Design a protein around this nucleic acid. Sequence first.
DNA 1: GCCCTTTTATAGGCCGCCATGCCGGGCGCCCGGCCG
DNA 2: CGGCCGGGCGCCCGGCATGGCGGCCTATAAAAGGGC
Lengths: 1514, 178
Amino acid sequence: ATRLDRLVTILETGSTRLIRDTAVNQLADWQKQHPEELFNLLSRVVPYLRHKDWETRTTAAKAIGKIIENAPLYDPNAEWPFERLCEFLKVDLFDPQWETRHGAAMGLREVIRVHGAGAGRRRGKTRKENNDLNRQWLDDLAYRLLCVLMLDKFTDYSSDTSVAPIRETVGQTLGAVLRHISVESVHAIYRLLYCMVTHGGMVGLRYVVAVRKDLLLQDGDMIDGVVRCVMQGLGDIDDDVRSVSAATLIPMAKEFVMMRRSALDSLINIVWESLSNLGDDLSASTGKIMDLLATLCSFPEVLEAMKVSASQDEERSFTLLVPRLYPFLRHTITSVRLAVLKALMTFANLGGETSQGWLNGRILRLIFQNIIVERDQDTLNMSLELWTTLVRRLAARDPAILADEFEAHAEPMMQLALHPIGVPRHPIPMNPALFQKPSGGVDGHMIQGEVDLVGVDVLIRSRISAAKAMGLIMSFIPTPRLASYDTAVLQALSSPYASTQLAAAMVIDEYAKNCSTPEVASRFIEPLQKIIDLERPSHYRDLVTYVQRVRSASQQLINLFRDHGKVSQGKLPTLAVVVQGEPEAGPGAFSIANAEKVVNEDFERLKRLMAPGQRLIALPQLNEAREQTVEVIEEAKAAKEARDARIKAAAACALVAMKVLPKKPSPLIKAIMDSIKTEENQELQSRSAATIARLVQLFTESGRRGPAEKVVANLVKFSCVEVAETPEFPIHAHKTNVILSMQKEEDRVDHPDAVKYAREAKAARITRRGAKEALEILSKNFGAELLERVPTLRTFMEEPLVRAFSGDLPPEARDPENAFGQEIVDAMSVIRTMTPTLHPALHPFVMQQVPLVIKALRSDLSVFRYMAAKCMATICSVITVDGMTALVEKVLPSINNPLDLSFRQGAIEVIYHLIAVMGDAILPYVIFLIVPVLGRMSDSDNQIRLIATTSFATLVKLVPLEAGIPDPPGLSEELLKGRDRERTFIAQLLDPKKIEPFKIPVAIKAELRSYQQEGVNWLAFLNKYHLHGILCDDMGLGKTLQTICIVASDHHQRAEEFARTGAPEVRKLPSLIICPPTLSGHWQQEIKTYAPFLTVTAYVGSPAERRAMKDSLDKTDIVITSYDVCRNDIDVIEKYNWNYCVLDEGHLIKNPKAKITLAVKRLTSNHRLILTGTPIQNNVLELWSLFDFLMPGFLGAEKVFLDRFAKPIANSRYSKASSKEQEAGALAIEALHKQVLPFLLRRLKEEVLNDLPPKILQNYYCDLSDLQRKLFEDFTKRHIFQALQYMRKLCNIHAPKLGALRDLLVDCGIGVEPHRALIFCQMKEMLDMVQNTVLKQMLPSVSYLRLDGSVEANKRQDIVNKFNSDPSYDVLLLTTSVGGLGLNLTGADTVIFVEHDWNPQKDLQAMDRAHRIGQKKVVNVYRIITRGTLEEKILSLQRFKIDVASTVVNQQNAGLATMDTDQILDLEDMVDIETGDVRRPGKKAAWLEGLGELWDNAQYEESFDLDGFLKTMQ
Amino acid sequence: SGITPTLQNIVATVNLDCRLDLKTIALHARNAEYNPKRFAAVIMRIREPKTTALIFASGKMVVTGAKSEDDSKLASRKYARIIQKLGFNAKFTDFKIQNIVGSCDIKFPIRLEGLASKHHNFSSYEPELFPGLIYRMIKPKIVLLIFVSGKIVLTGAKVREEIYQAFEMIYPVLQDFR
DNA sequence: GCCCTTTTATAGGCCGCCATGCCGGGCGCCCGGCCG
DNA sequence: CGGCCGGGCGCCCGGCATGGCGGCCTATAAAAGGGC
């Protein structure tokens, strides 16, 4: 896939807007860089216009728009290029499907916008005669769009107001097209559309009036006709037609107003009367008429019209017209309910003459009761703002006007604002007589106080909003007049209802807050102080239900003592008939303390004398009942406690707003802090959170030190209570070599053994949400001056970190039992909470802590690294340029440190948290940290591998479009230079503009042949990016020289820069080489000659001597070790950390279950390499084992690989022609190959070298005798292993195999009478069979010799070098599985396989005894086989296995490998069915089929808003 | 007496007096979805009450997802007005509730095997098709349900206060079982 | 009060699979011991 | 004593039927419902 095609895919799939609008921008810019290949991009981006999903279709339309901005306009006078595209889209414009017509119209929109001026031109015809074709073509397109407008029927009723997406889009396209055509055609379009007014495509008129304004100047008939249409549309029956006809006037009122007096003077009257026609319960058309009326009424000439109409007729006066709006103030539909508020608020700002009439007491009262009964947040907010504007101007006339205007309603509305809430089952209704209707001076369960339908969040919000409103007018009333409000609020301040008392405190809070000066509120100081610090009343009227429940449970206990305790009565305690706090209840009534004393003391008293002996069986029920009463009593007490805390806080906040602070302020501070900790209702908690910051500001400004210091320290402590965001050091102090960011997978995070965990998990975040907002508001209040005047907030933020990480960690920090460990996991949390809203002037202070935070990121304790990673991901995302240059230079290089593990885990954890927190703004810097993550994705430690692949799964999708990203605006040079360096570093991995061949240093001998140089270059390519692979070359090639070249080059480069710079990440560490033991001397001699500067130590040796290298083993540069001692001494060789682990024989680890592979997989190494002769022998799972050694996370989990490849490959044993049994394997082979390809390197000795001799093969066929086949059959009629072995035995002087061998060898010099032959067998018995017959009876002439497993290792060398050099030996008898590695049988002429083996690679390895570098005569190999026998089955299976073994690797080279390595390396609580009788089946028909989720409505408004289009259309 | 339940779902039905077709509803509106193969009837959604409604070819309707009586009535009437707007004749006349789904979480986990032992004359504890137990309580007539975790679900009621009346009388017996 | 449909079941016949079964061959590390 | 000889057990290799193990859909069986 090209860069173009990977990039353009991002338009369809992407994380967010910020990514796709970058993708489209890069696509358009790259087209500007290559303007000649336009349609190569267009043919790729166009097909998304038929995509089924709205969200990608619109951005594809944006793409085809932006991309064509570059191309020049066609003009033949200075074959229209898009003729094919427009011809397609203009027919998709009538597609029966829905999606494609929207797509086609939106594409034509952009094409016609950008290049419409050249549409339909023709070559070689003069301007005056091709203008005809241009005009005709644009007119035809307009004709088609009008036909669609008349025939559109695909609408959307998903919201209160309908919309027609196809009609809107084609309307926009017609608005686009008609900008280019001449007025001669525009008039025909206008006439046709006006006929369509008479169902109606009226939106065309909106767009016509929008884009063209020469037309309204051309003649008055245009404007007359359009507004005649609109006038006959406003009064229509269909509410849908009303809305669309009303909409058209809104954007064009300004250019409409001056046409003529009468037109406006009539339009305004019809607008008013259509408004006055009362709406239906389910019609939102009125809401848009409100916007029309608010638009017209804002312009002065409309005011003049209304004024002169009022002078003519009083009934038409504005003062009388305005109150027609009032019945809609509580219409059911949310849209109109808010639109009326908007319009009336606009009317409020309309000056003096137009406001003085209607702005009277009635609308104040109506808006106040409206804010009380509102439930939608948006409507309530708008209404409160409206109230503020009305009160402000009405007071801005003078205070006495307002006082006289509103005092008529002071009593009922003051009563209504202070009205209590009450507990759910027992609400106190509002007195409905207070609710004046709008007409005279459905959703009423709000005034019922029906808490069961409306949660207490809504009601508390309503009451505090009412207080927030009424405290405004209480400030503008002249203070001598206040008596009616003042007495009411002051009596409510001692009400027996908790809610009323709190609301009174809220009202005074608002009053004192916004009052002009604080001492005006001075008369309230004592009544607020006493509530703040007097001991409270013990009963509250709204809480009566709780104590009633308590009495019920106590009565249950007392009755239980009769029914189950058998207690004779006449001495039980009487429980009172009335519960405390109820109306008219005397002090004798039932109190909670009476219940509490009954629940223990009288309980014990009766247990002293209840039924004797039965006590032991009354005990369980009585104890359960006592536990029940204890459960309810403390719940009621806690409810009282929370209510009392809330009233105390509401008092304290008002008192501090009045700027009173007693000499010892402990009660205020406690009242506020205990509320911050507890109150769950966010809209209430925020008030305390802000006023505590006000208190800190006031205390520190007043010249008082202690209380400010104390309370800021206390809330700083409160900030860190959230365990899930600030882990407990005492729990985690001992944990190391683990990354907490992955630990969410672990058990015990949610503590399932106790629900107390859930309680604390709630209560901790409840206090954190408050304290964090308090800190942020404090930061906003203090600005640049913060750390100058709040000293402790510096100390907690810096000084523990300074002491901890200035040098080595002191021993105190490692104790979970010690305080200092927790302090420095807290300080980074303080920074994490402060920095995103700290004032920009203090960024240097935060940056001065980065050297300490980054040091803490490289520390032993896992909790410290976790917090450091989060804090760094926060700092570097807030302060981007300075934080990230520090990161890029300091910790980014450490990510490749192989010497130890603590540093690397932090270096990857910070990347994980940084990607997560930074989000899609990371694009300016992704190129810095992509390739370290690719390096770590193959790393040893499983935690690092998992985090790395999780990060890379997202990081890879950004990088296709980063090539070209603009720089950050403010940019340190140290990073930009880094950016160029990284771009060039990764370019060689991104495209075939490759580096020149690796410069092997001259310290290594300069004798390399071409293919070996290519192999060293490939290994250097692997070394650069920390990839791993297999140098799977054939024998005889200089594999050892290549691997030593790369290894010595790596060690030399590592040596030099460790000396040059003081970086621990590069100091030397030893390598190890694992080989079969016999090759140890070969390796030692070869390294000693070709790489003299490397020290080498052979670990193989006698165990008593081997024991002595337990610590010395680190000293060397290279270790050489046998596999078979590594399996034994893995326990002591694994403890070290090495570089460049090399395996000389991959065949030993091929099987996942062999012990040697389980040993080798345990090693930790910086780089891995295998020098196997042949990876594939039997099946691809053997290759999985190798790749599990190399890079575990690449080829996937074992049985998943099995399912994907191993079985599909195995299916092809008996493949037919064009069968799926064959095609599945054919797919699997290439699917595996394209993934494996860049990591293998296969080269055939017969293709690279012609120095070695040629090769020939032949097959030799023989008979099957009568006795042989009778034995076959008589066994056939009788595990599989027994039969298989028996068959392979019995199928072998009258036997055909021996006769074939006899006649073959008498076809050679050995038998007829120099010549040399090798005889290969698989069973030693068969070697004996040939031995004891061929030279004994058949051909005694042959000078035979033997070599098999029986021959001891001390004489095989003498025997073989005798044979290969002495001409007297005619024939060598041997078994294939003997020796293998270096058996020197090069002198042979011919190879005879007397019998065959299941392993093909073993047979090729046996052939390589003769076909070797040490020969020049042709090698001719014969395979004897008997017709029809089991031998043929063996050979066919061998053929299939070698077939897959070949095609799975096929051609390989350094340059023929592909560049797209990144693309492969990533690898309800109750459902009771509601369509029938109730049941819990768990699955149902209707919804489970993919009903999905309903779309958000914003996408319509963000695409059909006329203003954006009109800007886009010049 | 004790902690109050809450309502989480409502269901109602109307016999819209017409034999209206379905594929027209499926074609003309983006809002509707429809295929006879997988389900019998058209499904519609609307955003303000946040409910879903099923329109059957016989003219009968079902509404779902509302959380109050008047809210469900408003939604159903709104749907009836939508169908009228699509060109078919309609009347919103007969309105009946057909389900309620109360929900609450008991303050403790339950050893509900004892709720089988001492109350199998009404209760049942089989895990074969669902978690927890079923309690086909007869008066008030609701198909009560309890989970082991303590979540309690009250089903099949026809009027609001019925759920509270059922909860208040079941809670004392489940109190016994930890 | 009865027939056939639909969902549901314990069983049938198999689709699909996991892990084992072996003995004749070979290299290798380890021990006890004789070699000089 | 280390060097070298010999005995020694260990560790890997190599095929495909077969029994266990399970669920795939439908059988012969069952309750609940549309239709009469």
